[PDB]
Amino acid sequence: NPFSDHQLEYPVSPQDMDWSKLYPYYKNQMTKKVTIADIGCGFGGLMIDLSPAFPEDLILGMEIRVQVTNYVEDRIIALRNNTSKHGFQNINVLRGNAMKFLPNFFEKGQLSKMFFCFPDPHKARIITNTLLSEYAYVLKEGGVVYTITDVKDLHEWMVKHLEEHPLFERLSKEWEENDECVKIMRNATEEGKKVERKKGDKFVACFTRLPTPAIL
Ligand SMILES: C[S@@+](CC[C@H](N)C(=O)[O-])C[C@H]1O[C@@H](n2cnc3c(N)ncnc32)[C@H](O)[C@@H]1O
Numbered sequence: 002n003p004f005s006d007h008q009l010e011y012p013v014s015p016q017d018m019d020w021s022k023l024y025p026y027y028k029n030q031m032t033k034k035v036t037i038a039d040i041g042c043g044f045g046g047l048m049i050d051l052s053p054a055f056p057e058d059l060i061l062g063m064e065i066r067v068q069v070t071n072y073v074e075d076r077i078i079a080l081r082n083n084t085s086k087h088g089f090q091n092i093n094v095l096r097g098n099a100m101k102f103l104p105n106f107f108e109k110g111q112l113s114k115m116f117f118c119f120p121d122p123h124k125a126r127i128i129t130n131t132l133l134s135e136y137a138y139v140l141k142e143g144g145v146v147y148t149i150t151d152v153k154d155l156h157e158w159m160v161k162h163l164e165e166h167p168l169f170e171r172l173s174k175e176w177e178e179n180d181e182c183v184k185i186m187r188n189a190t191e192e193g194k195k196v197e198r199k200k201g202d203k204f205v206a207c208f209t210r211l212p213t214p215a216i217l
Contacts, residue, residue: 003167008216026090035061037114040099045073046190048092062094070096107139116147119192122155137168142212151196156204169208
């Protein structure tokens with residue numbers, strides 16, 4: 002019953018995407034896939050910091066504002082230029098609305114990490130468990146959703162729906178405290194550096210994408 006949305010006769014495939022233009026350095030064919038996604042990345046700070054931490058992972062920021070994504074593109078081109086032969090070659094940005102069906106972008110289980118760093122607290126579609134189900138679809142079993150905000154109400158709203166969904170399980174404080182991504186995530190971004198200035202609080206919460214029960 003509760004997992005019907007995830008045991009599918011006709012699972013979808015992504016639309017055609019020339020990832021080689023975003024990560025030409027892995028053009029043999031394409032050598033890797035995007036495995037880390039920064040949803041609503043803003044000016045790209047998180048990606049910049051994750052880049053060296055995860056030199057083997059391709060990292061993609063998705064940003065709905067074209068002004069910001071046009072800017073971020075010039076920024077990572079600068080970072081590549083001013084840099085060894087692999088520097089910042091594993092990050093790029095994409096103009097897109099993450100609420101418009103992520104399975105158009107990524108294969109099933111493609112991603113190991115999804116970051117929602119200081120999301121703004123329903124034009125294209127209403128926010129629902131269905132959205133979280135689309136996130137679960139593109140997220141590997143064992144993958145993690147990383148969540149941080151200064152807005153207690155947004156924090157509690159995200160937590161409420163993530164724990165309601167049957168494919169997400171909250172990770173402990175201990176897990177968070179020993180995780181390098183939580184550390185980076187806390188102050189990698191302009192909005193995060195803002196909040197500490199305002200003496201604000203940083204509400205973190207992380208979830209594992211549970212394995213889907215087997216159907217056969
Ligand atoms: C509050 S800002 C946080 C920016 C950055 N993540 C940080 O921590 O500094 C949220 C960003 O997500 C973008 N955004 C809002 N809704 C989005 C959506 N539906 N899809 C993709 N990006 C979105 C906004 O343009 C904004 O830049």
